[PDB]
Scaffold this active site. Structure first.
Site, PDB file in Angstrom:
ATOM      1  N   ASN A  91     -73.297  38.719  41.611  1.00 59.94           N
ATOM      2  CA  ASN A  91     -73.461  37.570  42.525  1.00 59.94           C
ATOM      3  C   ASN A  91     -74.444  37.779  43.653  1.00 59.94           C
ATOM      4  O   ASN A  91     -74.265  37.008  44.627  1.00 59.94           O
ATOM      5  CB  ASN A  91     -72.053  37.218  43.077  1.00 59.94           C
ATOM      6  CG  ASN A  91     -71.101  36.882  41.945  1.00 59.94           C
ATOM      7  OD1 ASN A  91     -71.447  36.361  40.863  1.00 59.94           O
ATOM      8  ND2 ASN A  91     -69.828  37.261  42.102  1.00 59.94           N
ATOM      9  N   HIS A  95     -57.639  38.289  41.140  1.00 59.25           N
ATOM     10  CA  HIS A  95     -58.934  38.208  40.449  1.00 59.25           C
ATOM     11  C   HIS A  95     -58.755  38.323  38.944  1.00 59.25           C
ATOM     12  O   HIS A  95     -59.230  37.467  38.142  1.00 59.25           O
ATOM     13  CB  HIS A  95     -59.887  39.264  41.060  1.00 59.25           C
ATOM     14  CG  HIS A  95     -61.250  39.229  40.449  1.00 59.25           C
ATOM     15  ND1 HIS A  95     -61.587  39.910  39.294  1.00 59.25           N
ATOM     16  CD2 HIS A  95     -62.376  38.627  40.898  1.00 59.25           C
ATOM     17  CE1 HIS A  95     -62.853  39.671  39.024  1.00 59.25           C
ATOM     18  NE2 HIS A  95     -63.366  38.922  39.981  1.00 59.25           N
ATOM     19  N   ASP A 106     -59.817  44.722  34.899  1.00 56.26           N
ATOM     20  CA  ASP A 106     -59.883  44.034  36.231  1.00 56.26           C
ATOM     21  C   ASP A 106     -58.808  44.597  37.152  1.00 56.26           C
ATOM     22  O   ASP A 106     -58.378  45.744  36.937  1.00 56.26           O
ATOM     23  CB  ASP A 106     -59.749  42.540  35.920  1.00 56.26           C
ATOM     24  CG  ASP A 106     -60.599  41.586  36.722  1.00 56.26           C
ATOM     25  OD1 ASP A 106     -60.426  41.551  37.948  1.00 56.26           O
ATOM     26  OD2 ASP A 106     -61.414  40.782  36.283  1.00 56.26           O
ATOM     27  N   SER A 114     -68.075  36.320  37.629  1.00 53.25           N
ATOM     28  CA  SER A 114     -66.771  36.816  37.196  1.00 53.25           C
ATOM     29  C   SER A 114     -65.998  35.729  36.458  1.00 53.25           C
ATOM     30  O   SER A 114     -65.185  36.055  35.576  1.00 53.25           O
ATOM     31  CB  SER A 114     -65.916  37.228  38.375  1.00 53.25           C
ATOM     32  OG  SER A 114     -66.221  38.515  38.807  1.00 53.25           O
TER      33      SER A 114
END
Ligand SMILES: [Ca+2]
Ligand SMILES: [Ca+2]
Length: 269
Positions: free
Chosen positions: A153, A62, A32, A215
Protein backbone atom coordinates in the site's frame (compact mmCIF):
# COMPACT_ATOMS: atom_id res chain seq x y z
CA UNK A 1 -30.27 -11.37 5.45
CA UNK A 2 -27.05 -12.06 3.52
CA UNK A 3 -25.43 -9.29 1.38
CA UNK A 4 -22.91 -9.73 -1.45
CA UNK A 5 -20.14 -7.17 -0.97
CA UNK A 6 -19.36 -5.13 -4.08
CA UNK A 7 -15.98 -6.75 -4.97
CA UNK A 8 -17.51 -10.25 -4.82
CA UNK A 9 -19.88 -9.32 -7.54
CA UNK A 10 -17.20 -7.18 -9.28
CA UNK A 11 -15.12 -10.29 -9.68
CA UNK A 12 -18.29 -12.17 -10.72
CA UNK A 13 -18.10 -14.94 -8.17
CA UNK A 14 -21.92 -15.42 -8.22
CA UNK A 15 -21.73 -16.40 -11.93
CA UNK A 16 -19.34 -19.18 -10.87
CA UNK A 17 -21.43 -20.17 -7.85
CA UNK A 18 -24.31 -20.60 -10.39
CA UNK A 19 -22.35 -23.27 -12.22
CA UNK A 20 -21.71 -25.49 -9.08
CA UNK A 21 -18.29 -23.87 -8.35
CA UNK A 22 -17.82 -22.87 -4.77
CA UNK A 23 -14.24 -24.03 -3.99
CA UNK A 24 -15.38 -27.34 -2.48
CA UNK A 25 -12.47 -29.68 -1.66
CA UNK A 26 -9.89 -26.90 -2.20
CA UNK A 27 -7.59 -26.20 0.77
CA UNK A 28 -6.71 -22.56 1.41
CA UNK A 29 -4.27 -21.36 4.03
CA UNK A 30 -4.54 -17.74 5.23
CA UNK A 31 -1.05 -16.63 6.52
CA UNK A 32 -2.07 -13.66 8.66
CA UNK A 33 -2.96 -12.60 12.25
CA UNK A 34 -5.24 -15.67 12.86
CA UNK A 35 -8.96 -16.19 12.05
CA UNK A 36 -11.55 -15.71 14.86
CA UNK A 37 -14.46 -18.15 15.22
CA UNK A 38 -17.37 -16.46 13.46
CA UNK A 39 -20.89 -17.66 12.53
CA UNK A 40 -20.19 -16.89 8.82
CA UNK A 41 -16.89 -18.84 8.65
CA UNK A 42 -15.89 -22.55 8.74
CA UNK A 43 -12.23 -22.85 9.95
CA UNK A 44 -10.95 -26.37 9.42
CA UNK A 45 -7.57 -26.17 11.30
CA UNK A 46 -4.31 -24.20 11.22
CA UNK A 47 -1.24 -23.55 13.43
CA UNK A 48 0.40 -20.45 14.93
CA UNK A 49 4.13 -19.69 14.41
CA UNK A 50 3.94 -16.58 16.62
CA UNK A 51 5.70 -17.28 19.96
CA UNK A 52 3.40 -16.04 22.72
CA UNK A 53 0.06 -16.59 20.75
CA UNK A 54 -0.27 -20.36 20.55
CA UNK A 55 -3.87 -20.08 19.42
CA UNK A 56 -4.99 -19.36 15.83
CA UNK A 57 -7.74 -16.99 16.95
CA UNK A 58 -7.31 -13.45 15.60
CA UNK A 59 -6.29 -10.76 18.03
CA UNK A 60 -6.17 -8.13 15.29
CA UNK A 61 -9.14 -8.64 12.90
CA UNK A 62 -7.03 -8.47 9.73
CA UNK A 63 -6.95 -12.22 9.05
CA UNK A 64 -10.63 -12.70 9.96
CA UNK A 65 -11.37 -9.94 7.38
CA UNK A 66 -9.20 -11.53 4.68
CA UNK A 67 -10.61 -14.95 5.38
CA UNK A 68 -14.20 -13.81 4.88
CA UNK A 69 -13.38 -12.38 1.45
CA UNK A 70 -12.26 -15.88 0.45
CA UNK A 71 -14.88 -18.06 2.08
CA UNK A 72 -17.68 -16.36 4.12
CA UNK A 73 -20.40 -19.07 4.12
CA UNK A 74 -23.27 -18.82 1.64
CA UNK A 75 -26.32 -18.95 3.95
CA UNK A 76 -28.83 -16.40 5.32
CA UNK A 77 -26.44 -14.15 7.31
CA UNK A 78 -23.51 -11.77 6.96
CA UNK A 79 -21.59 -11.74 3.70
CA UNK A 80 -20.41 -14.01 0.98
CA UNK A 81 -16.98 -15.28 -0.05
CA UNK A 82 -15.60 -15.86 -3.56
CA UNK A 83 -15.20 -19.61 -2.70
CA UNK A 84 -17.71 -20.13 0.13
CA UNK A 85 -17.06 -23.93 0.26
CA UNK A 86 -13.26 -23.67 0.36
CA UNK A 87 -11.57 -25.52 3.26
CA UNK A 88 -10.02 -22.72 5.32
CA UNK A 89 -6.96 -23.12 7.50
CA UNK A 90 -5.83 -20.43 9.90
CA UNK A 91 -2.04 -20.05 9.74
CA UNK A 92 -0.90 -17.35 12.27
CA UNK A 93 2.37 -15.77 11.20
CA UNK A 94 1.49 -12.28 12.36
CA UNK A 95 0.78 -11.27 15.96
CA UNK A 96 -2.05 -9.14 17.37
CA UNK A 97 0.03 -6.02 16.71
CA UNK A 98 -0.27 -7.04 13.04
CA UNK A 99 3.42 -7.62 12.39
CA UNK A 100 5.50 -10.80 12.33
CA UNK A 101 8.99 -12.03 11.42
CA UNK A 102 10.09 -13.63 8.12
CA UNK A 103 10.80 -16.64 10.17
CA UNK A 104 7.17 -17.02 11.23
CA UNK A 105 6.01 -16.30 7.68
CA UNK A 106 8.48 -18.85 6.23
CA UNK A 107 7.39 -21.45 8.84
CA UNK A 108 3.77 -20.89 7.81
CA UNK A 109 4.53 -21.59 4.16
CA UNK A 110 6.55 -24.62 5.12
CA UNK A 111 3.54 -25.79 7.07
CA UNK A 112 1.28 -25.08 4.05
CA UNK A 113 3.52 -27.08 1.74
CA UNK A 114 3.67 -29.98 4.23
CA UNK A 115 -0.12 -30.00 4.76
CA UNK A 116 -1.23 -30.15 1.13
CA UNK A 117 -2.68 -26.63 0.97
CA UNK A 118 -3.70 -25.76 -2.61
CA UNK A 119 -3.62 -21.95 -2.14
CA UNK A 120 -1.75 -19.79 0.31
CA UNK A 121 -2.99 -16.24 0.99
CA UNK A 122 -0.36 -13.71 2.11
CA UNK A 123 -1.97 -10.33 2.63
CA UNK A 124 1.36 -9.01 3.95
CA UNK A 125 4.67 -7.70 2.69
CA UNK A 126 7.94 -5.86 3.05
CA UNK A 127 9.78 -3.49 0.76
CA UNK A 128 12.94 -5.46 1.57
CA UNK A 129 13.85 -8.81 0.05
CA UNK A 130 14.48 -11.88 2.30
CA UNK A 131 16.47 -14.94 1.29
CA UNK A 132 14.56 -16.97 3.97
CA UNK A 133 11.25 -15.79 2.69
CA UNK A 134 12.12 -16.44 -0.96
CA UNK A 135 13.21 -20.07 -0.36
CA UNK A 136 9.96 -20.74 1.55
CA UNK A 137 8.04 -19.24 -1.32
CA UNK A 138 9.86 -21.47 -3.76
CA UNK A 139 9.48 -24.54 -1.55
CA UNK A 140 5.73 -24.18 -1.05
CA UNK A 141 5.56 -23.69 -4.82
CA UNK A 142 7.33 -26.91 -5.64
CA UNK A 143 4.97 -28.65 -3.13
CA UNK A 144 2.17 -27.52 -5.44
CA UNK A 145 0.85 -24.50 -3.44
CA UNK A 146 -0.25 -21.35 -5.33
CA UNK A 147 1.14 -18.40 -3.34
CA UNK A 148 -0.93 -15.19 -3.76
CA UNK A 149 0.54 -12.03 -2.13
CA UNK A 150 -0.45 -8.35 -1.76
CA UNK A 151 1.59 -5.82 -3.78
CA UNK A 152 1.53 -3.35 -0.84
CA UNK A 153 0.00 0.00 0.00
CA UNK A 154 2.90 2.49 -0.44
CA UNK A 155 1.43 3.65 -3.81
CA UNK A 156 4.90 3.34 -5.33
CA UNK A 157 5.74 1.98 -8.74
CA UNK A 158 7.51 -1.11 -7.34
CA UNK A 159 5.87 -3.93 -5.38
CA UNK A 160 6.63 -5.57 -2.02
CA UNK A 161 8.19 -8.96 -1.15
CA UNK A 162 7.12 -11.65 -1.33
CA UNK A 163 4.75 -10.48 -4.07
CA UNK A 164 7.81 -9.38 -6.13
CA UNK A 165 9.19 -13.02 -6.35
CA UNK A 166 8.55 -14.85 -9.60
CA UNK A 167 6.88 -17.70 -7.73
CA UNK A 168 4.32 -15.46 -5.94
CA UNK A 169 1.14 -14.27 -7.65
CA UNK A 170 1.18 -10.48 -6.97
CA UNK A 171 -2.19 -8.79 -6.47
CA UNK A 172 -2.95 -5.04 -6.64
CA UNK A 173 -6.14 -3.12 -5.78
CA UNK A 174 -8.81 -1.38 -7.86
CA UNK A 175 -11.66 0.88 -6.84
CA UNK A 176 -15.34 0.84 -7.94
CA UNK A 177 -14.34 2.72 -11.09
CA UNK A 178 -12.02 -0.09 -12.12
CA UNK A 179 -9.12 2.30 -11.58
CA UNK A 180 -5.98 1.38 -9.58
CA UNK A 181 -6.48 2.55 -5.95
CA UNK A 182 -3.87 5.25 -5.21
CA UNK A 183 -2.23 3.19 -2.48
CA UNK A 184 -1.80 0.14 -4.65
CA UNK A 185 1.83 -0.63 -5.42
CA UNK A 186 2.47 -1.54 -9.07
CA UNK A 187 5.36 -2.11 -11.57
CA UNK A 188 7.34 -5.28 -12.35
CA UNK A 189 6.14 -8.60 -10.91
CA UNK A 190 2.52 -7.33 -10.67
CA UNK A 191 0.25 -10.11 -12.04
CA UNK A 192 -3.36 -9.03 -11.61
CA UNK A 193 -5.69 -6.74 -9.67
CA UNK A 194 -8.93 -7.07 -7.69
CA UNK A 195 -11.26 -4.92 -5.60
CA UNK A 196 -9.55 -3.40 -2.64
CA UNK A 197 -11.52 -0.31 -1.59
CA UNK A 198 -14.36 -0.38 0.94
CA UNK A 199 -14.30 -4.10 1.27
CA UNK A 200 -16.90 -5.44 3.63
CA UNK A 201 -16.17 -8.74 5.40
CA UNK A 202 -16.22 -10.81 8.63
CA UNK A 203 -14.62 -9.32 11.69
CA UNK A 204 -13.99 -10.60 15.20
CA UNK A 205 -16.84 -10.23 17.72
CA UNK A 206 -19.22 -11.77 15.22
CA UNK A 207 -19.47 -8.59 13.19
CA UNK A 208 -18.71 -7.16 9.72
CA UNK A 209 -16.31 -4.28 8.89
CA UNK A 210 -15.10 -2.51 5.73
CA UNK A 211 -11.39 -2.06 4.96
CA UNK A 212 -9.10 -0.80 2.21
CA UNK A 213 -5.91 -2.29 0.88
CA UNK A 214 -4.11 -4.76 -1.40
CA UNK A 215 -4.65 -7.04 1.59
CA UNK A 216 -8.34 -6.91 0.70
CA UNK A 217 -7.73 -7.40 -3.01
CA UNK A 218 -5.48 -10.49 -2.54
CA UNK A 219 -8.23 -12.76 -1.14
CA UNK A 220 -10.50 -12.20 -4.11
CA UNK A 221 -7.71 -13.81 -6.18
CA UNK A 222 -7.03 -16.62 -3.71
CA UNK A 223 -10.72 -17.41 -3.93
CA UNK A 224 -10.86 -17.22 -7.70
CA UNK A 225 -8.02 -19.78 -7.75
CA UNK A 226 -10.06 -22.22 -5.62
CA UNK A 227 -12.98 -21.98 -8.04
CA UNK A 228 -10.70 -22.92 -10.97
CA UNK A 229 -8.97 -25.66 -8.94
CA UNK A 230 -12.41 -27.14 -8.25
CA UNK A 231 -13.25 -26.95 -11.97
CA UNK A 232 -9.82 -28.41 -13.05
CA UNK A 233 -8.74 -30.68 -10.20
CA UNK A 234 -5.73 -31.85 -12.22
CA UNK A 235 -4.27 -28.35 -12.79
CA UNK A 236 -1.10 -27.27 -11.03
CA UNK A 237 -0.38 -23.95 -9.32
CA UNK A 238 1.16 -22.55 -12.56
CA UNK A 239 -1.72 -23.57 -14.81
CA UNK A 240 -4.21 -21.90 -12.43
CA UNK A 241 -2.18 -18.75 -12.09
CA UNK A 242 -1.85 -18.43 -15.87
CA UNK A 243 -5.51 -19.16 -16.54
CA UNK A 244 -6.46 -16.42 -14.09
CA UNK A 245 -4.18 -13.91 -15.89
CA UNK A 246 -5.27 -15.04 -19.36
CA UNK A 247 -8.94 -14.63 -18.44
CA UNK A 248 -8.61 -11.30 -16.52
CA UNK A 249 -10.26 -8.14 -17.87
CA UNK A 250 -7.76 -5.73 -19.31
CA UNK A 251 -7.95 -2.35 -17.50
CA UNK A 252 -5.06 -0.50 -19.12
CA UNK A 253 -1.26 -0.59 -18.71
CA UNK A 254 0.16 -3.85 -17.45
CA UNK A 255 2.63 -1.72 -15.41
CA UNK A 256 -0.36 -0.56 -13.33
CA UNK A 257 -2.68 -3.55 -13.54
CA UNK A 258 -0.68 -6.59 -14.65
CA UNK A 259 -3.15 -8.86 -16.51
CA UNK A 260 -6.22 -6.84 -15.53
CA UNK A 261 -9.09 -7.51 -13.11
CA UNK A 262 -9.61 -11.08 -12.07
CA UNK A 263 -12.81 -12.56 -13.56
CA UNK A 264 -14.09 -15.75 -11.90
CA UNK A 265 -16.86 -16.00 -14.50
CA UNK A 266 -14.46 -15.97 -17.43
CA UNK A 267 -12.14 -18.24 -15.44
CA UNK A 268 -14.55 -21.10 -14.64
CA UNK A 269 -15.88 -21.19 -18.12
CA1 LIG B 1 -23.00 -15.68 4.78
CA1 LIG C 1 5.27 -11.65 -8.95
Amino acid sequence: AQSVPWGISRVQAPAAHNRGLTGSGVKVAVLDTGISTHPDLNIRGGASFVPGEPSTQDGNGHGTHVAGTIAALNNSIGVLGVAPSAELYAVKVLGASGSGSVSSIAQGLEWAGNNGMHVANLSLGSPSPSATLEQAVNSATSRGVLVVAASGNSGAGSISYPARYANAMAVGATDQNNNRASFSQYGAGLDIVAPGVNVQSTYPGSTYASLNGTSMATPHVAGAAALVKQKNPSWSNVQIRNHLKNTATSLGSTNLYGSGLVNAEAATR
